[PDB]
Write a protein that binds this ligand. Sequence first.
Ligand SMILES: CO[C@@H]1O[C@H](CO)[C@H](O)[C@H](O[C@@H]2O[C@H](CO)[C@H](O)[C@H](O)[C@H]2O)[C@H]1O
Lengths: 133, 133, 16, 15
Amino acid sequence: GKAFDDGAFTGIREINLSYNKETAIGDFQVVYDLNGSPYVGQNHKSFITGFTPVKISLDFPSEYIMEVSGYTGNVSGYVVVRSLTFKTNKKTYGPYGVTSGTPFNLPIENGLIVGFKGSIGYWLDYFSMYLSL
Amino acid sequence: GKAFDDGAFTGIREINLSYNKETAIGDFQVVYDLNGSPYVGQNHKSFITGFTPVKISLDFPSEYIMEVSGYTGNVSGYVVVRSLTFKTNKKTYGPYGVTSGTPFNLPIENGLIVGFKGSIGYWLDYFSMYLSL
Amino acid sequence: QSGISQTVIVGPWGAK
Amino acid sequence: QSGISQTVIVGPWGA
Ligand SMILES: CO[C@@H]1O[C@H](CO)[C@H](O)[C@H](O[C@@H]2O[C@H](CO)[C@H](O)[C@H](O)[C@H]2O)[C@H]1O
């Protein structure tokens, strides 16, 4: 897959992703907050197409992500993130994509996701998160 | 369980925990660094005995934890931390306990675990970790 | 704010 | 040091 790294920003305003329930999470793009103004992140796109796009539009600044969880599993020989769920103080968005395989979750007791990095080939291979106060 | 919250420190020097190879994690205790001095954190003790103690003595400050992982699951009907594994830049300590149930993992690409909080009754019920640069 | 300094905390894992 | 600010990073998940 093609590695990406957004670096760190002030907060998150919108998450844009795509998935296919038969396979895994496909594209990923975040609209960040940068010093109280929207910053449109790079769109990190799969090698292939056919996915279902979703827009998660957060009521920033009062709504923020409290937990990112998911499943990883093998799709056509590739171990990829097959499912994502984003839980905010206001609501849960997801699961998007097939909820079978090995679960992961990052719950946050204090602090803010402020950036994403990872890798996307045919599917989202993996991702990490920047956290700040 | 009985709640505990050590708070945040400069680093970790040593983890003293106990486990049963048939059940879950019991006692948990941490010697932190506090600005260059060992800080003996309070021994957080299971309400029950029968555990096998483990002393994870890190080569602070050159050695530091890069991933904490484990399993949560039912024991006697309670969800508890059944297993913990501490991987550092030098070597892997664990798994300790029973490697069964829902897996979890917090890998750290950048930054440091500087504190623990949680709750222990018969077993370690749950926990969280303070992170810092 | 207060005079208490803050730190990122991730978790909890385990009983909810 | 360098002139680049740093930030805690957790991950990755997926493998
Ligand atoms: C038998 O004693 C129990 O030990 C358990 C496993 O360590 C729990 O600590 C239990 O305390 C109960 O824990 C549950 C969590 O699933 C919940 O907090 C409940 O409110 C609490 O009494 C303890 O009695």
